[PDB]
Paper text:
[name] ([name]) terminates cholinergic transmission by rapidly hydrolyzing the neurotransmitter acetylcholine, and it is an essential enzyme for humans and other species. The catalytic triad in this enzyme consists of Ser203, His447 and Glu334 located at the bottom of a ∼20-Å-deep active-site gorge, where the residue numbers are based on the sequence numbering of mouse [name] (mAChE) that is used throughout this paper.
In this article, we report a structure of the sarinnonaged-conjugated mAChE in complex with HI-6 (HI-6•sarinnonaged-mAChE) at the Michaelis-Menten state and supporting crystal structures of the corresponding aged complex (HI-6•sarinaged-mAChE) and mAChE in complex with (E)-4-carbamoyl-1-{3-[4-(hydroxyiminomethyl)pyridinium-1-yl]propyl}pyridinium bromide (K027•mAChE). Gratifyingly, the final electron density map from the 1-minute dataset is of good quality and clearly defines the sarin conjugate including its isopropoxy chain. The electron density for the side chain of Asp74 is disordered and thus modelled in two conformations: one is similar to that found in the apo mAChE structure, and the other, which is dominant, point with its carboxyl oxygen toward the central linker of HI-6. The oxime-pyridinium ring of HI-6 enters the catalytic site and forms cation-pi interactions with side chains of Tyr124, Tyr337, Phe338, and Tyr341. These observations suggest that the oxime-pyridinium ring is rather mobile (adopting multiple conformations) in the active-site gorge.
Numbering used by the authors: 1 to 257, 265 to 492, 497 to 542
Write the structure that this text describes.
Amino acid sequence: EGREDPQLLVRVRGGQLRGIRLKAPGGPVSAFLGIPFAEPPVGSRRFMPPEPKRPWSGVLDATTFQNVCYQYVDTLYPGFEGTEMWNPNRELSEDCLYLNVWTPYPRPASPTPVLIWIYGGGFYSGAASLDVYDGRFLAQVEGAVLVSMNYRVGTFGFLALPGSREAPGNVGLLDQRLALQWVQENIAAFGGDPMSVTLFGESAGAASVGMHILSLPSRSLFHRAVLQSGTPNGPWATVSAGEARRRATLLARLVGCNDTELIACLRTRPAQDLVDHEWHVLPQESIFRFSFVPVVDGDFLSDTPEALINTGDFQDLQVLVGVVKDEGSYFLVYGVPGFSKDNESLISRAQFLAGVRIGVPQASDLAAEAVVLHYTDWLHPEDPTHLRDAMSAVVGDHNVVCPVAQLAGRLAAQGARVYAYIFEHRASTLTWPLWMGVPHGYEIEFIFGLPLDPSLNYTTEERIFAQRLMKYWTNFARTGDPNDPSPQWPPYTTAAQQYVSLNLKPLEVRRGLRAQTCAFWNRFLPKLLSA
Ligand SMILES: *[C@@H]1O[C@H](CO)[C@@H](O)[C@H](O)[C@H]1NC(C)=O
Ligand SMILES: *[C@@H]1O[C@H](CO)[C@@H](O)[C@H](O)[C@H]1NC(C)=O
């Protein structure tokens, strides 16, 4: 301070910050990266609810991203951009509770609507610093204030001995909640409007947004929510207290460890030892299942998300939810034999039956038969191309498309204003093979407006498409309505079940989100599982 850029010095509750001026394609933006919002949850604080960060002295340098929360690093396809883009891009550390703010430059002179991003990655990975979550474009082009926070994942964020004091569960969700409290207190300092805060996230980040909707103390911290390909209901986003306890104690055993004693022993283990064993505690060979996720603790979650969306009053809530065209394909190449990014993955009937048992790992024999019966093409029951695509649909429908359907429906029936979409454009720059279609996670780079960066090699149409999506999302944040006061985007309702297609063509309205197949998963499967 003296010779420094006066536009980049800001004070928050904990002290003084110095940000950085970044170049976006249409002009500069302000970034404040690596702002601590919690005491490092290390040592005796592992597994504990986060504690608000204590004020610092001097000017904290906020010009670079901070550490990524310790996590498993995916190694299926080494050096291949398809997997690498999701991997940690800063040092892994338990000291990782930091958040990031982008704003116009100079800062808005009047209060601007805030978007808060929560990343996905199965509650076992992810980071707010990845290139695909870069807020410079939304800030520069839409004038948004954008916030994203790291939160603890894996065991560090989600290992629970329900009822204990030392490992109560859900602390990754409480990391997110603390960041939201930080926004309420401090965002006015950056030109943000704490009275207009829209949450958005994808996959597990979406489930997270969902859980904030369903958890009362989070409710006063935001006004609107966007759930991209993820929901708090469904088969992967939560586990019961019993199951959480069973996994935590199996994991303790695997690393050589009365809850207080078990937990103290876990606290002496190297971070990397926990990461090395976390995946071993799943009860069946699975895909789209994760070891350490939110637990129904009767605390953060007072009941299952199913019970809470069923009985909730959602009157003052606006919500944007949707899915990509091919939610399942991405997951098949990891753990279903016969699938691969490097060939067409034309599978046999035998491999379809086997993949159904992996895709629906909780299924009894009869339930699995029902799944196979429903997805088999009975004019061509052995055709490898249909079996390959049907396998994808099983996984995408069970895990994402049908839970989203159930969510939109319950939320509307109960007074929320809902807008639904299906995203159907495949990036021209996609490195996954064609058969995977428009895979899970590949809408994000358009919502954040990466196609605006000329060096990324997107097409001109893709550039205009990204601009449209950015408008929808920020209109929504701003007013609860994606429409600009072009074809209209009607609200989703139980009666008409309308949603739109997001692609290069103008909005097209459709009805029924896999209505027929989703009745199978949402109404019939549960009844069949008992017995
Ligand atoms: C594609 O590759 C996978 C793994 O290498 C293999 O199991 C599968 O059989 C291959 N597909 C065909 C039909 O060759
Ligand atoms: C974009 O295209 C140019 C020209 O071939 C190439 O040199 C550059 O590496 C490309 N960047 C990406 C990420 O595709």
